[PDB]
Ligand binder design. Structure first.
Ligand SMILES: CNc1nc(Cl)nc2c(Cc3cccc(Cl)c3)[nH]nc12
Length: 164
């Protein structure tokens, strides 16, 4: 069912995450972590304190799809587990140094063709697929986007709800 999902998405904030390769999204799904550039890291840390749920919606560049979405479970933290990200060009391991913990809500794909009817007021009402890494997505757009994803029956939202 979608009732627990809607409860998780209630009053959430949504951010578009653009990854330059598939390997880091695979790593994020396996290990429950994400790292981003310092400009976006500051935005997510601020949002994490401000909202019941902060939702990251992932898209690998050139894939024409979203690869799933997840909820922040912590602010960024340094040290510890040094994630072996596959670094793109012009990207250093110190730029991706802050590590957020994330709980996946959906690890299923959604093609961009399925979200063509959703526009993002915080990006000039362009289709929600369009946006830079870290672009915030307005509440109603982000909620409907997340509801378009196929259900992920491998995930039990019960423990996610407890962390709220
Ligand atoms: C684990 N974190 C990440 N992995 C990858 Cl492959 N790409 C990421 C981007 C997008 C981007 C924006 C500006 C410059 C560059 Cl080079 C890339 N943001 N976070 C990323």
């Amino acid at each position: 069912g979608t009732s627990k999902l809607k409860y998780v998405l209630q009053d959430a904030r949504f951010f578009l995450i653009k990854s330059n390769n598939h390997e880091n999204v695979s790593l994020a799904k396996a290990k429950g972590v994400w790292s981003t550039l310092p400009v976006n890291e500051k935005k997510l840390n601020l949002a994490f304190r401000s909202a019941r749920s902060v939702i990251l919606i992932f898209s690998v560049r050139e894939s024409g799809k979203f690869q799933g979405f997840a909820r922040l479970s912590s602010e960024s933290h340094h040290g510890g587990s040094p994630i072996h990200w596959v670094l793109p060009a012009g990207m250093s391991a110190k730029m991706l140094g802050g590590v957020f913990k994330i709980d996946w809500i959906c690890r299923r794909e959604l093609p961009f063709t399925k979200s063509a009817h959703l526009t993002n007021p915080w990006n000039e009402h362009k289709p929600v697929k369009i946006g830079r890494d870290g672009q915030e997505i307005e509440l109603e757009c982000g909620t409907q986007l997340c509801l378009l994803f196929p259900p992920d029956e491998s995930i039990d939202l019960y423990q996610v709800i407890h962390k709220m």
